[PDB]
Design a binder for this molecule. Structure first.
Ligand code: 0MS
Ligand code: 0MS
Ligand code: 0MS
Lengths: 430, 430, 430
């Protein structure tokens, strides 16, 4: 833990020093450095570098102005290495990619790409890290969802270093599955010589199963570089204090930060805020109920958000652009989990699925129909297993949210209970 | 459109002139002519004529009095032909039958007739135009529901002009089905020589399918004759202005009309009003949600309506009868559709049917169970097709309600969302 | 009825005289005699007698004190016989056992015992009278649930008087089943020579079926002995007035009684009250909706009750114990039923399970999916039968609740509509 917090603390400290350096280069005011659109361009530039540029937004005579500029990749690559105490520091780079991955996950549906891969577009909840490059970091692998891994595997299916890269991705997917049955099917896809349609059919099956028997997918609060830099500048030592991606730290940092955003004419700044909050705590595919309870205010579905993406395109004119504060704080916090929830055990039950009439009164007599009727080769084992699962089943027994002052997660608050962020479009009402 | 509005405008103009004529014959006051019970008798008389009579209600010394009278069928038949500029005018007649059909559809469940035909009594939503005579008009055919057509077909199954009338009804049903699979099954029932139990079994199957893969059934706002007549009298020219059954016109006319009803001691006039509003816009089997949103006030299920039928029987005594205004106006309007909604296409999906846990918090993990589990000869094609359908699926993408001033349907309002009018009795709570 | 009310009135009159006698022996004040914990010990002592003792709670110098004492079984057995006018009076004894059975049914989940018997722990609603001894009274047999009978039958399966006791329990279970198919399966378990796994598998099947096709299980309001005794003492004659266990009498008696309870530091007295009210009217496995409507205030699930059991263990210290009034009255009353609801008939339907679109408006088009899709050896007959059942189906047509003044059940009030008491734990949210 101390050792982990030490290295994490270093890479966040690196990103910070880099951002401050980059902010002085461009001669940006502190406020300007803390504009989200400016942070994303600077983040983009260091990622492309490993000519490079993008739009940078300044404040001249009461109006927001765009001014795209370019740098040498070598100059940036030099500035990054040196902000990270000599080392090449690839870890801090994939941390900015995962942040971009998370914001993409909240902003865009990847339906157009799912159909090409022959996948059900209703698998979006399985698509964490889909806009993340194949062969990302170890951190990138961890964050990638079951569906993402399946999609990457099909692209391959559809040069003996190709076979090892195939087996690598199979093992990444296998390690994510929490049941033996699901894992044995991955062995049958990996062990296959010259993969084709059978493996395609198998991976589509496995994806569907992961909607019920969920895979272990890592979640990491990753913040725009301007949040870290602003903290390094203001006198916070990430190396002496350490840092966590899954503990309280990102929540605490956001509670001590103020980021800004460019907002368009018709857009609701509160809705823009939800989007960046969701991305910040990797929450695109969380239950809206749990997000809402943590944040304090309601977390509304994508289709009910009166907002477009964070990035302002080259097309649109700056004259109508205004700048708003992003509300990125929370009521409570919670530990970010690697778990997909309970998949097996099946240790007893405890519950009630029907009633026995005591009073002679006119009424319907409720019963849990799917569950009662349910109880009446590896695919067969999988089907039977996911037929046993009920939406009513509770995962993460005992674990709860925490107050912002409870840094050591001493006193968990267990909450009393629309769930899907992407279940509200012109074709479906979920 | 202009040509259609021209003929529609003429037949509504005919009905108007007829009603005014009939109102002067009976020496009725304007108010009395606009009593719904009086309109229904006059409507009945011209339909029977093609001795004939019924109850007529007057206002003598502060009390409502019933006074049944009879006319020569020939005299009525003469009065109808002449109000319709010489022509026999059968179209205007079937328009009054469809109005009666719609009021029946809202007033009575046809369960007793469904059981005799060997049909599930839960098919009421398929029963538009069931009280409409076999071999009605072309308009009558259009308005008749899938279930109605099936019921008529069984009565036949249970004289070579019998075979053509059989094939006619098959084609009416076929034209209503929006899938190839459903249509090919109708060919197999029609092509059959000497129909029997196989065809009975096939048509029962087809009826069940039409609850999910819905048929194209026409909907026509048809108003009591007293509404049209009152407009002709007050100076409205249906021929110069044209008229529509599916556009704004009936809504606009109702917004400029005042009809009355006889109300019994225990009855809620507001509930009586809902019933006649439902009948007026052919809405017996609509989603109560959409009816409520259009009308402005809640549209309550039949079992929660403290009202009986519009017609006051010969048995009941007039001394307790009072007269109320029927509230037949709306907040908005909407185009009446021929469509049954989306049945096929299956072009991608876009949506979310599960969640991925981000926070370590005690909770259930929702998922759309029927949908996920779903994906695991013409009857087989039909079953597979209706197993793909979800109640969550959206039909009529882009189309919405309109303000009463938007005559050209320029600006659609898409609404934000109990659905069944007949799902609230002593045996079922739907 | 008069004859039944006569004998019931006698046994309740016996229990009363016994309790008063026992209260004078222990030199208890009236208030103390009406403390629920004191009533349960006295009840326990007469049941064990047929050395015996338990805790008795007094009020000394502003503090509650525990003082366990013992009696001769023979002395108690003498006191019971004589309070019941000479007779041995076993009936009044099983009435106190059924009361304890009901309080257990409300207090404890029997999941740990269900798993040992190889039964689904979600069958709790079938477990009325599980803590009641095998071979109880005839009254005890009636009150025992389908699941209880199955559990007892397995214990047997897992000395030719063993065979008759086996056949006896089979007949008790058979008489409870409301369908022929379920009854014929019980014949196949009973007729079996040397029972084993086939019978185990059959009885588990039968238990599952009874969640949908419910068995006829008796329900009896049985009150703590202190309620009866307090009424005998205050001048009520149960023998002249008669008494009922299923009519108005227990409701009326509770409305004229005041019982007390020992309450722990953290406990909500209102929640303690719900628990004893539930036990009093045998309502552990009723729909919470109907319980709430009758009682007047909400009847909360077990997991949301901030209370533990009624009995205060020898471990816990009395110094923190305070005494509260138990709120055991109701808004209305209802007849306690022997019926499990409608299981067959299938006489038509009457209802609506889909809609037909009238307006061209963007929306989902609801339909009852399970019901529509449903319609597409004795076990097979059972499966098909329970596949026809819908949670929406109405049982007890016409029957309703009554005002406390309507003793003759003249005017039934039919109510307008969380259902499970045990569907709210750390593993399931039902
Ligand atoms: C930014 C931040 C990020 C994370 Br992850 C957690 N904690 C954070 N802060 C740091 C600043 N902070 C203060 O109260 C301070 C400090 C201060 C400075 C550093 C450490 C502690 C303290 Cl207390 N020095 O002056 C004031 C005033 C609030 C908590
Ligand atoms: C009855 C009605 C049915 C339908 Br379908 C649509 N529109 C309708 N009306 C007609 C009457 N109306 C008026 O404002 C008028 C008119 C008037 C008369 C005819 C046409 C237009 C007008 Cl504007 N002449 O005087 C006043 C006053 C309201 C709208
Ligand atoms: C206890 C009780 C249980 C059941 Br089961 C039903 N009814 C019950 N009571 C009895 C007492 N009670 C009274 O009003 C009385 C009576 C009285 C006493 C006995 C009978 C009737 C009456 Cl009215 N004698 O004085 C007053 C005062 C209320 C109703």
């Amino acid at each position: 833990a101390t050792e982990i917090r030490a290295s994490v603390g270093k890479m966040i400290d690196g990103i910070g020093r880099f951002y401050i350096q980059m902010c002085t280069e461009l001669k940006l005011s502190d406020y300007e450095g803390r504009l989200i659109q400016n942070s994303l361009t600077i983040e983009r530039m260091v990622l492309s570098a490993f000519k490079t540029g993008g739009p940078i937004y300044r404040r001249v005579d009461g109006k927001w102005r765009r001014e795209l500029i370019l740098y040498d990749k070598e100059e940036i690559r030099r500035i990054w290495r040196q902000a990270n105490n000599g080392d090449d520091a690839t870890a801090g780079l994939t941390h900015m990619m995962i942040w971009h991955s998370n914001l993409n996950d909240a902003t865009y549906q990847r339906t157009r790409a799912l159909v090409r891969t022959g996948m059900d577009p209703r698998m979006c909840s399985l698509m964490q890290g889909s806009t993340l490059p194949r062969r990302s970091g170890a951190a990138g692998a961890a964050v990638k969802g079951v569906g993402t891994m399946v999609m990457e595997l099909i692209r391959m299916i559809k040069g003996r270093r190709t076979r090892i890269a195939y087996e690598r991705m199979c093992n990444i997917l296998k390690g994510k599955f929490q049941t033996a049955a699901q894992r044995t099917m991955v062995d049958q896809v990996r062990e296959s010589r010259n993969p084709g349609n059978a493996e395609f059919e198998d991976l589509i099956f496995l994806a569907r199963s992961a909607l019920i028997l969920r895979g272990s997918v890592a979640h990491k609060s990753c913040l725009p570089a301007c949040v870290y830099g602003s903290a390094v500048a203001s006198g916070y030592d990430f190396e002496r204090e350490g840092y966590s991606l899954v503990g309280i730290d990102p929540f605490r940092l956001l509670q001590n930060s103020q980021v800004y955003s460019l907002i368009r004419p018709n857009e609701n700044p509160a809705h823009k805020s939800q989007l960046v909050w969701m991305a910040c705590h990797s929450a695109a595919f969380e239950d809206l109920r749990v997000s809402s309870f943590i944040r304090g205010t309601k977390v509304v579905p994508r289709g009910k958000l009166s907002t477009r993406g964070v990035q302002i395109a080259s097309n649109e004119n700056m004259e109508t652009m205004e700048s708003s504060t992003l509300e990125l704080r929370s009521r409570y916090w919670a530990i970010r989990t690697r778990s997909g929830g309970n998949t097996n055990q099946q240790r007893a039950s405890s519950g009630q699925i029907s009633i026995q009439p005591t009073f002679s009164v006119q009424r319907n007599l409720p019963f849990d129909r799917p569950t009662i009727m349910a109880a009446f080769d590896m695919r067969t084992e999988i089907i039977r297993l996911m037929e046993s699962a009920r939406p009513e089943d509770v995962s993460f027994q005992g674990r709860g949210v925490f107050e912002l002052s409870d840094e050591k997660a001493t006193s968990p608050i267990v909450p009393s209970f629309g769930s899907y962020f992407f279940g509200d479009n012109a074709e479906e009402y979920d």
